[PDB]
Amino acid sequence: SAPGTLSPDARNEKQPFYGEHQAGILTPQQAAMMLVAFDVLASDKADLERLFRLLTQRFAFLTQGGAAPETPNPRLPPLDSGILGGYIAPDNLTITLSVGHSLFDERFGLAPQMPKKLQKMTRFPNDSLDAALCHGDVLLQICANTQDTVIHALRDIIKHTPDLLSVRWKREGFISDHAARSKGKETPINLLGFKDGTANPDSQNDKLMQKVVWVTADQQEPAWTIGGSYQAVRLIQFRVEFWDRTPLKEQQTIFGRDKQTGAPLGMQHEHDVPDYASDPEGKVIALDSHIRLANPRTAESESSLMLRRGYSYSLGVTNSGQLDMGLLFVCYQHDLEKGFLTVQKRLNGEALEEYVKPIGGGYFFALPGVKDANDYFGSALLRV
Amino acid sequence: SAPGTLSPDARNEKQPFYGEHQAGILTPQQAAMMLVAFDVLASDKADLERLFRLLTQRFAFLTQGGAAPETPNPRLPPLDSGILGGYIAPDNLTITLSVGHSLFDERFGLAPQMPKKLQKMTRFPNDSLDAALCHGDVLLQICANTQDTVIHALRDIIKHTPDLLSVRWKREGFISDHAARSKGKETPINLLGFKDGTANPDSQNDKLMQKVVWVTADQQEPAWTIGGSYQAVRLIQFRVEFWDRTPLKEQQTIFGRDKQTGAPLGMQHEHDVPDYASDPEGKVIALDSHIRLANPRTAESESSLMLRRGYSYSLGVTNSGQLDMGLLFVCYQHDLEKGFLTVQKRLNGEALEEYVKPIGGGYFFALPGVKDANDYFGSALLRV
Ligand code: HEM
Ligand code: HEM
C-alpha cells in the first residue's frame, strides 16, 4: 500500500516541486514513469552549476505547469514540442534528479565530497547486464499521470541542454490501471500477476522515513547529502511465456504470497505478517521464497528496510524471440550498503531467478530537495 | 475527426466483436494499441482451421469481458495471467485479425484464393527496413482503453497457442491523452506535435466506407474477401531531436498545415479544405508538402483515399544514441494498389523524408467479420 497511488485522470493536480526533500520518492506513484539517464557534457564545475541551475528552472516550471512557450518568430524552432497543445498542465508530474558515481571523478573536482557508500553497479550472480543500459552521470525519474506529460518533460529538457546533456539510456513504464485509479486503496500489480509494494514501510510516517529513506546528520556522509537518499535501479526482464506456463502452486511458493489475496501463504489478509519462527523447515513460506529471503523479519536487521517505487514495463521482442516485459525496479534508502546491496546479496539464489533477468540500471544518489526559489540542485554540494 | 476517439476511463464499455466487419477498423481510437505479428506454426490446412476457430472463441470472450477464469486445481498453470485482477473488463478491447501474403504459400493451399492486390512489402526509396520488424503470417491489432487490457489479451492468446503461434515482431502504441479524453472532438496529436487525422474520410458514413475501405462484389476479388479490407502498416522512426531543433516555419512548410490550429496554411479552421487549383506554384501549400502529395484533391485522387488509424510510439534509445520514437502507421483501403501503394508512390521524395525513417511493417488483408457465435475467422476462405 505505501506510498499509495494517484489518479491518471487528475490533469490539474500538482505535486510540490519545492521541499526539504525531492518529490517522487514518498510521492504516491503516478500512472506513468520514465527513467532516462544522461551523460554530462559539462566542461567544468562552473558549467556544471549552469546545468543544475538550468534544471531547477525547468523542473519548477514543468511541475506546476502553465501556458506553453509560444514562438513569435516562426524562423526559430518552437520553444515547445506542442505535443500537449497550448497549455502544459502539471498532471502530477514529478522529476527526481540523481547523480551517478562517475560524476565524482577528475572532471568536476567532487571526489572528496562523494557519498560514502556510493559505488558503480557491478554484476550479481543472475545478471545479464547490458552496458547500453547501465550507469550514467545523472538519472532523471520522470513521473506523471500520463505518458504525454513525461515525454513532454524530456524533450523540453533535451531542447534546453544540447551542449550540456547527452541521452544515455531510457525506459518508460506504468503502474496497473485499476490500482492507479484506486487512489492508494489497492496495491499495484506486476506483470507476473502479484501484488507488489505491500510490505513497504509506511511512507506517510515522517519519523520512520528519517530512519529508512532520508540521509540524516548522524551519518558519516558529507553534509550536503543530508536530506537526500541513495537510489538503486534495476531493469529486470521476465521470462513471461515460461511464467504463464508455470503452476499456480509454484508461482505462490516462489513468492511466498497468495496471488489473489496478497496474504502471506497460510494467512488471509494482504497486510498479514508471517512468522518464520514457526516455519523453520520453510514448509508454509519457503526459505527459497522472495519474501522470506528479502526480509527474514528478524527486526535485528530492520536496518535493511527500504521504500520500493517500481513500475511495470512492456517493450518489444528479445533477441531470443520472446516478449520483452518486466519490472523497472526503483528503491530509496538512507544507506545503499545497509539497504539494496544487503537485500540483493540476500536474494542471490532465490527460486525467482529462474524467471527473471536483471539487465540494467545503476546506483545513484538522489539530491536534497530545493528549499525555495533561490536554491538550486546541489547548491550545498557546490559551495562548502 | 474520423475515426474519432474513446475514453481511457471507460472500463465497462464494450465493442461488438461479431458482425459484417471486424472491429478496430472503423472503431473510434482507444488510448492503447499493440501490433503483433505471428509466424503461424500450423502444419496443414486442418491445423489452420483449428487456429482460426480458437482465435474466434478467445477474442469473443476477451473483447466482451467477464470474470477471470478460475483455476480450481493449483497444480496447473493459472488459466488467467491475473494482471487484470479478478475481472477481465471489456475496456473497449477490439482485436483485429489480418493475414500476410506468406500465408498463401504451399503450406495450406490457399494460393488460388489469395486477394488480388496482396503482396510482400518491398522498399520505397527512403526505407531502412529491418528484417526483424517486417511481415508475418498473421498480424493482430489489439487496442483498448489501457495498456493493461492489451497486454492481458496477448498473453491469453499466446498461452493458448504454443503449438500454432510464434511471436514474430511486436510494437505498442498510444494516442495523445487529451484527445482520447475528448471522445472525437479533438484530432490526435502525433509526436512531432502536429494534428494527425484531420482529413480522414467519414467513418460513420455508411455509404462512403463501402467505396473506400471495404471490399465489395463490384471489384473482382475472391468472394470470401467481401467485407474485409487491405491493411498497410508502417513502423516509422522520427528524428526527434533534429525535428525539435528545426524552425517552426519549416515544420509547417513540410506538412503544409498550421501547427497550432491544424488549419490548412493560409486558412483559419482545422476542417478547412485546401485550394490547390488556386495555387499551382505552391506558395501557400508546398509542392513537396505531405498533405498536397498524399492527397492532391482532384478527380483521379478520389480513388486513392484511405482511413488512417495510426498511433504514436515511444521506446528507448536507438543504437546510435538518439530517441527511439515515431508512428505506428496503420491504414485501411478497399484496394492496396489503389490505396497505400498509390499514395506512397506520390510521397516518394517529399520533404518529410528528412525527418522520418520507415524501419518495419507490412501488408496484410484484414478478414471479414465473424458473422456470429456460429461463425469463425476466415470460414469462407477455408470451406471451399
Ligand atoms: C525480480 C523482480 C521482482 C519482482 C517481480 C518482485 C515482486 C515482489 C513481490 C510480489 C513482493 C511481495 C509483496 C510486497 O511488495 O511486500 C515483493 C516483496 C519485496 N521485494 Fe520484490 N520483486 C522483485 C525484485 C526485487 C529486488 C531486486 C529487490 C531488492 C533486493 C526486492 C525487494 C523486496 C523487498 C524488500 C520486499 C518486502 C519483503 C517483506 O518485507 O516481507 N524485490 N517483491
Ligand atoms: C511518420 C510519417 C507521417 C506523419 C508524421 C504523418 C502525419 C500526417 C499529418 C500531420 C497529416 C495532416 C493532418 C491530416 O490530414 O490527418 C497527415 C495527412 C495525411 N497522411 Fe500522413 N503522416 C505520415 C505518413 C503517412 C503515410 C506513410 C501515408 C500513406 C502513404 C500518409 C497518408 C496521409 C494522407 C492520405 C493524409 C490526408 C491529407 C489530405 O488528404 O489532406 N501519411 N499525415
Which residue matches cell numbers 565524482?
A: A104
- CA–CA dist A211, A302 (Å, integer): 10
- Cα–chain center distance at A297: 24
Closest CA to A231 of A215, A246, A243: A215
Ligand 2 centroid distance, CA of B199 (Å):
9
- CA–CA dist A213, A205 (Å, integer): 11
Task: Specify the experimental method.
Answer: X-ray
Closest CA to B355 of B205, B192, B172: B192
Ranges assigned E (strand) in chain A = 32-40, 66-67, 87-88, 94-100, 138-144, 165-174, 229-238, 307-308, 311-317, 323-333, 356-366
- CA–CA dist B267, B274 (Å, integer): 8
Per-residue DSSP letters for A166-221?
A: EEEEEEEEE--HHHHHTTTSSPPB-TTS-B-STTPPPSS-HHHHHHHTS--TTSSS
Closest CA to A239 of A254, A223, A249: A254
Q: Provide the shortest C-alpha distance from residue A253 to chain B (in Å).
A: 11
Taken in order B204, B210, B211, B215, is the CA torsion positive or negative? positive
Nearest CA in chain B to A322: B167
Q: Could you give the C-alpha distances from A142 to A32, A57, A157, A183, B320, in angstroms and in order?
A: 8, 16, 11, 19, 23
Which residues face B230 on adjacent strands?
B333, B365
Closest CA to A95 of A64, A67, A132: A64
Nearest ligand by distance to the CA of A326: 1
Split into its structural domains, chain A has a count of: 1
Residues near A113 by beta carbon (within 8 Å), at least 6 away in sequence: A104, A222, A224, A381, A384
Taken in order A10, A12, A16, A22, is the CA torsion positive or negative? positive
Q: Range of B217's domain?
A: 1-384
CB contact under 8 A, B176 and A8: no
Which residues face B99 on adjacent strands?
B138, B365
Please tell me if the CB atom of residue A149 comes closer than 6 angstroms to any atom of ligand 1.
no
Nearest ligand by distance to the CA of A126: 1
Q: How many alpha carbons lie under 13 Å from residue A179 in its C-beta half-sphere? A: 31
- Give the DSSP letter of residue B31: S
> Do A182 and A5 form a contact (C-beta atoms < 8 A)?
yes
User: Diameter of chain B by CA atoms?
Assistant: 74
Which residues face A37 on adjacent strands?
A139, A169
Residue A30 in grid coordinates: 503516478
Q: Is residue A261 a known part of a binding site? A: no
Please tell me if the CB atom of residue A356 comes closer than 6 angstroms to any atom of ligand 1.
yes
- CA–CA dist A193, A199 (Å, integer): 17
Left if phi > 0, otherwise alpha if psi is -120 to 50, otherwise beta: which for B179?
alpha
* Exposure b/e, B347-382, CB count within 10 A at least 16 = b: beebbbbebbbbbbbbbbbbbbbbeeeeebbbbbbb
In B174-233, the residues whose Cβ lies within 8 Å of chain A are: 174, 176-178, 181, 189, 191, 193-194
Q: Provide the shortest C-alpha distance from residue A379 to chain B (in Å).
A: 30
Breakpoints of chain A, after residues (C–N > 2.5 Å): none
Per-residue DSSP letters for A287-323?
A: TTSHHHHH----STTGGG--EE--EEEEEEE-TTS-E
Please check whether residue B311 touches A, CB under 8 A: no
Residue nearest to atom 33 of ligand 1 (CA): A294
Per-residue DSSP letters for B298-321?
A: STTGGGG--EE--EEEEEEE-TTS
Q: Is the backbone peptide bond immediately before A3 cis, with ω within 30 degrees of 0?
A: yes
- CA–CA dist B69, B35 (Å, integer): 25
Helix (DSSP H) and strand (DSSP E) numbers for chain B: 9, 11
- Cα–chain center distance at A3: 12
Please tell me if the CB atom of residue A197 comes closer than 6 angstroms to any atom of ligand 1.
yes
CB contact under 8 A, A81 and B193: yes
* Exposure b/e, B71-84, CB count within 10 A at least 16 = b: beeeeebbebbbbb
Query: How many A×B Cβ pairs under 8 Å?
Result: 161
- Cα–chain center distance at B351: 24
> Do A136 and A100 form a contact (C-beta atoms < 8 A)?
yes
- CA–CA dist A264, A255 (Å, integer): 9
Looking from the CA of residue A262, the nearest atom of ligand 1 is 13
- Cα–chain center distance at B292: 23
Residue B37 in grid coordinates: 505479428
Q: Is the backbone peptide bond immediately before B3 cis, with ω within 30 degrees of 0?
A: yes
Angle at Cα B341 formed by Cα B340 and Cα B344, nearest 5°? 80
- CA–CA dist B158, A240 (Å, integer): 10
Closest CA to A79 of B242, B255, B195, B245: B245
Which residue matches cell numbers 491469453?
A: B156
Angle at Cα B257 formed by Cα B143 and Cα A149, nearest 5°? 45
Breakpoints of chain B, after residues (C–N > 2.5 Å): none
Residue B27 in grid coordinates: 472503431
Residue nearest to atom 12 of ligand 1 (CA): A196
Which residues face B129 on adjacent strands?
none
Q: Provide the shortest C-alpha distance from residue B349 to chain A (in Å).
A: 23
Residue A311 in grid coordinates: 513500475
- CA–CA dist B335, B366 (Å, integer): 12
- CA–CA dist B168, B138 (Å, integer): 9
